[PDB]
Amino acid sequence: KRQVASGRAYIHASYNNTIVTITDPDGNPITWSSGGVIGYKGSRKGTPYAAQLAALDAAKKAMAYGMQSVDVIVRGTGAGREQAIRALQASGLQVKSIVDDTPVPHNGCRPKKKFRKAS
Amino acid sequence: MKVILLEPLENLGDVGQVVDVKPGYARNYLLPRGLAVLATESNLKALEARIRAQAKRLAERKAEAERLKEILENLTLTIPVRAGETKIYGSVTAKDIAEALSRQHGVTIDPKRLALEKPIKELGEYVLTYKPHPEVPIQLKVSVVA
Amino acid sequence: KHGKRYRALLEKVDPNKVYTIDEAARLVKELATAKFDETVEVHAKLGIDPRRSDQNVRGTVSLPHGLGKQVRVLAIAKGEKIKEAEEAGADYVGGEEIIQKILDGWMDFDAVVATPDVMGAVGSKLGRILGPRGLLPNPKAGTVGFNIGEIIREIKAGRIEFRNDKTGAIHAPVGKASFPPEKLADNIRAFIRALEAHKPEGAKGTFLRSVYVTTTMGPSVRINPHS
RNA sequence: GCCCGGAUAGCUCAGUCGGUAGAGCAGGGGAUUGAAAAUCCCCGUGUCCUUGGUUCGAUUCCGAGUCCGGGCACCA
RNA sequence: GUGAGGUUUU
RNA sequence: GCAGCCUGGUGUUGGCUCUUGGUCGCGCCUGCGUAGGAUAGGUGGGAGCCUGUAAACCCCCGCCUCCGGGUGGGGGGGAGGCGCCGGUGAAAUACCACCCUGGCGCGGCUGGGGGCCUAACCCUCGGAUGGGGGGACAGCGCUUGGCGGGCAGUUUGACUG
Ligand SMILES: [Mg+2]
Ligand SMILES: [Mg+2]
Ligand SMILES: [Mg+2]
Ligand SMILES: [Mg+2]
Ligand SMILES: [Mg+2]
Ligand SMILES: [Mg+2]
Ligand SMILES: [Mg+2]
Ligand SMILES: [Mg+2]
């Protein structure tokens, strides 16, 4: 396929998983990995050592394509997004701007009752 | 299948050769339209029995017919349409325009093959493939329906 | 690989030949520019399937002309070795009891001799260097005769073999760079039909497909399978 | 009868895509928990279908079938 | 921004 | 067995287009669990040839990639790359390729699945040799296999306090 250099990127940083996927300026992903490629089950794929072979593998199987920047978009907050994204921010990949799309859930009525014990 | 052509059918070779083609094509698309003929020993005798007396009729009915790009659509003319009716209620077809061009501007057309596919609601440019070994089509430009 | 020597006379490959018998068999002298003792290594093909039982390729045949190739075996002297000054024996070493498993041998094998016939106990113990390529002595090799002095005398000027594993990468070491069709008159006369007489019972198919007489210094020419 | 996938410890099962191997019971006592349940620990049971062969081997690959099944015939 | 396979009354 | 239903082939039944399929090797350059120096396929020659008809630390570079990296056009290099042994092991290359493992251009027929037109065919419109829609599908014939008590012809033995 045609390798791409410029473009934006998408970031998933939920409680159970932290995986990025680098896109084009049209919104087409280029790869995805996980912590399940080692076999990280449950919540063993959070913030400080075992699984930046998800996002850094998402830039490392994209290293053969050679992307320029990763414009950050974070869907799903908490659970240690900071060092997992900042591994890709300043240890090999350039960035253009920091304009984040934080998800703002309302849903009208309730989702699954895990949140409602602490409202 | 011995079929003889009278005009080039855009494929399948030239006129008068011994060409093979499906009977579903030649039987329904070529024979009732008057373009290809079943070739027996009679119709296979006729094309060499007349090599000038009918090829001159192809020169007349084709070389005389390939000059009708003069006063039909290339010159600028206001095409007569119906009264508005801002949004098109009845879409324009190949049939419903030559009586307008027959009332105003005096241009008489077939009116077949003025829409080879998709009789469409909208308006724009369109080419009229008049087909002696088909040549360059004349261009109509519908601009307004008011 | 596509260097200086292949760009010279690559026209003689000719992948659209019609029928060649002699002019693609004898032309190994100067189409193969060799300044050394080369082996012509005549190819062939035995058509079998290597993934079933009752199917064991093995072939050993001799050639009494001389081959330009000596015996060069590693003789180990044991009981019943000498023949009381038989005038053609006791030339190589007679001992040293090599147990060279440490530093894993010396990996330059040309011919292996083994006299005592103890293969039921030394099986997969003496054939340590040659497992899959298999220049180890075997009971199916046919080198078991009446007396002892018939193995060295046949490896000397003889004992060529055809046996393959999973493919047909086969060879026939007979001549030097300058051998004539008077030597092809016992090479391609008896070897290509020796691999047709020697045959496993599961032979079904083409059975003679890719027989190239190609060299180390020259191109790949093709003859008809009978010549 | 041609072809299709397999027979692993009283019970059944973790298997290999050729260099590995078994966990559970009627069982005895066992850090535990302040002497209570057993959460948890040693532990009684491999011709890995019968046999032949590339193979450093076979606890695993391939060939005939004796072991059981579905489709497919065929049965004077 | 964070924590429980979790217990029984002598 | 039949009625009826489903379904492949074929006639009615055509015009195009897209990517896929099969005997398909003329061609591309695909092998890294790997224990040492590794783009290390099993092996065949294995002391010659890469080489001044333009080398080497690695800079040309399409090619694929498991991301390490090797093999072709070589435009500017300028006698240096270093292997048979040691080293790895179930196997020793660098010179000539035997087919498997594969991304792939095409020689034979397009086999199937889609998108458009449509005159055949079908439905429909007041006064219908003309308009609209479906559209080579449906229906119908032959042939092939299956379902099929809805139906028909049938069998369901003998000894016997
Ligand atoms: Mg309590
Ligand atoms: Mg039918
Ligand atoms: Mg349509
Ligand atoms: Mg019609
Ligand atoms: Mg229509
Ligand atoms: Mg039909
Ligand atoms: Mg009945
Ligand atoms: Mg009756």
Q: C-alpha C92: how far from its chain's center?
A: 23
DSSP state of C151: S
Q: Which tokens is A57 given?
A: 């593998």
Distances (CA, A) of C102 to C45, C105, C138: 38, 7, 25
Q: Is A21 helix (H, G, I), strand (E, B) or coil?
A: strand
Residue C52, both tokens = 């079933």
Å between CA of C52 and C1' of F22: 28
Q: Which residue is nearest to nucleotide F87 (CA to C1')?
A: C103
Say if CB C92 and CB C155 are below 8 A apart: no
How far, in Å, is the centroid of ligand 6 from the Cα of B20?
24
Determine the Cα–Cα distance for residues B88 and B33; give it in Å rounded to an integer.
Answer: 33
- CA B3, C1' F11: Å apart? 21
The amino acid at residue C197 is: A
Domain boundaries, chain A: 1-119
Which nucleotides on chain F have any atom < 7 A from a protein Cβ? 12-16, 26-27, 41-54, 65, 67, 71-73, 84-92, 94-99, 116-120, 131-132, 136
Would you say C8 and C214 are in contact if contact means Cβ atoms under 8 Å apart? no
Is the CB of C100 less than 7 A from some atom of nucleic acid strand F? no
Distance CA C49, CA C64 (A): 32
- Note the Cα C21 to chain centre separation in Å: 23
10 Å Cβ neighbour count for C213?
Answer: 25
Q: How far apart are CA A75 and CA A101, in angstroms?
A: 7
Which residues are bridge partners to B126 per DSSP?
B140
| Burial class of residue A3 (count of CB atoms within 10 Å of its CB; 0-12, 13-18, 19+) | exposed
Whether A100 and A73 have beta carbons less than 8 Å apart is answered as yes
Tell me if A27 sits within 8 A of A90, measured CB to CB: no
> For A94, which DSSP code?
B
d(CA A28, CA A9): 9
Radius of gyration of the CA atoms of chain B, in A: 19
Structure tokens at B72: 């039909």
| CATH of span A1-119 | 3.30.420.80
CB burial of residue C23 (10 Å; 0-12, 13-18, 19+): exposed
In the numeric block, the tokens 């990763």 are attached to: A70
A85 by DSSP, 3-state: which? helix
List beta partners, residue C161. Answer: C60
For tokens 């990025």, name the residue. Answer: A20
Q: What H or E segment, with its residue span, contains residue A74?
A: strand A74-75
Tell me, in Å, how far CA of B88 is from C1' of F18?
Answer: 34
Kindly give, in sequence order, each residue whose CB lies less than 8 Å from that of residue C38, ignoring residues fewer than 6 positions away.
C32, C176, C177, C215, C216, C217
Q: Using an 8 Å Cβ cutoff, are C202 and C55 in contact?
A: yes
A37: exposed, middle or buried (Cβ count in 10 Å: 0-12, 13-18, 19+): exposed
The Cα A51–Cα A33 span in angstroms is: 10
Alpha carbon distance C193, C203 (integer Å): 15
Task: Tell if C1 CB is < 7 Å from nucleic strand D.
Answer: no
Contact between residue C51 and residue C196 where contact means Cβ atoms under 8 Å apart: no
Distance (Å, whole) CA A59 – CA A86: 13
Beta bridge partners, C221, equal C213
Nucleic acid strand F within 7 Å of B29 CB = yes
Q: Is the CB of C224 under 7 A from strand F?
A: no
Contact between the CB of C52 and strand D at under 7 Å? yes
C 155-214 residues, CB < 7 A, strand D: 165-166
Which chains contact B through at least 3 pairs of Cβ atoms less than 8 Å apart? none
SS (H, E, C) chain B: CCEEECCCCCCCCCCCCCECCCHHHHHHHHCCCCCEEECCCCHHHHHHHCCCCCHHHHHHHHHCCCCCCCCCCCCCCCCCCCCCCCCCCCCCCCCCCCCHHHHCCCCCCCCCCCCCCCCCCCCCEEEECCCCCCCCCEEEECCCCC
Q: Chains with ≥3 Cβ pairs under 8 A against C? A: none
Structure tokens at C214: 């190609």
Q: What is the DSSP letter of A69?
A: B
Alpha carbon distance C188, C43 (integer Å): 11
Distance in Å, residue B24 CA to nucleotide F148 C1': 38
- Sort strands B125-128 and C212-214 into parallel, antiparallel or unpaired: unpaired
Experimental method: cryo-EM
